[PDB]
């Protein structure tokens, strides 16, 4: 059973929101909507279909993407260890928006393929409980 306006699939309740927020804010927002809420996690094909269709119902734009609950924990800009020449990384010149450690799905792939995005972008999302 799910709260009014939430949809269910395999014992879980899902909900798409049009309001745009950063990845961290969406996650935080989802925790406050329902106990145990988080950004959706996709653990199978079946769930991928359900979620893709769920999203497609409310989100019609391609100007933005939809946040999903997968993200790189590391605080560094990259996780490898060295350059191809073997030397270590001891100087970076990254463009903030260029480090894409949060994932989202876009309309162009039918909201299925996981694409990398800069975590601070404001975008719609989906909560799962």
């Amino acid at each position: 059973d799910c709260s009014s306006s939430w949809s269910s699939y395999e014992g879980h309740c899902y909900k798409a929101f049009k309001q745009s927020k950063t990845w961290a804010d969406a996650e935080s927002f989802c925790t406050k909507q329902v106990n145990g809420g988080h950004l959706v996690s996709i653990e199978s094909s079946g769930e991928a279909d359900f979620v893709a269709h769920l999203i497609a119902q409310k989100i019609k734009s391609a100007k933005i993407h939809v946040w999903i609950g997968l993200r790189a924990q590391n605080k560094e800009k990259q996780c490898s260890i060295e350059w191809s020449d073997g030397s270590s990384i001891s100087y970076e010149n990254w463009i903030e928006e260029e480090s894409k450690k949060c994932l989202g799905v876009h309309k162009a792939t039918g909201f299925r393929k996981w694409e990398n995005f800069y975590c601070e972008q404001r975008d719609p999302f989906v909560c799962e409980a």
């Binding site: 988080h38 990259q78 996780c79 490898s80 350059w83 191809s84 100087y91 393929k113 996981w114 990398n116």
Partner: protein, 123 residues
């Protein structure tokens, strides 16, 4: 002190190529151009400015690979709900770093993309 077709800077030798290759092929290519040659690496801003000025002056505007690949493949990817990661649907497998001959800022792009590049080795 570098071969005539290469440019020097602080004991190093650099050379830009405009043969469109993906990251893996680019690196491998650089290794057979000279001993100890690899895709360029940046240890400072002065060096980066140097290579940029060099790449632009030679082939004008374009994108050039840097010696960094699979930058997030080893990161700790996790579901915020603590679900274990088994199912997968990555749009792109690996991401590599490149820079525009216009400025020295590091940029991201899938490693299977085709771009130009700069090779380097210790003189």
């Amino acid at each position: 002190d570098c071969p005539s077709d290469w440019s020097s800077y602080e004991g190093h030798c650099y050379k830009p190529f405009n043969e469109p290759k993906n990251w893996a092929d680019a690196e491998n290519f650089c290794t057979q151009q000279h001993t100890g040659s690899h895709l360029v690496s940046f240890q400072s801003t002065e060096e980066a400015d140097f290579v940029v000025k060099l790449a632009f002056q030679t082939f004008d505007y374009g994108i050039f690979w840097m010696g960094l690949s699979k930058i997030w493949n080893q990161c700790n990817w996790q579901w915020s709900n603590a679900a274990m990661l088994k199912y997968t649907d990555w749009a792109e497998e690996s991401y590599c770093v490149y820079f525009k001959s216009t400025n020295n800022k590091w940029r991201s792009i899938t490693c299977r993309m085709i771009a130009n590049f700069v090779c380097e080795f210790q003189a």
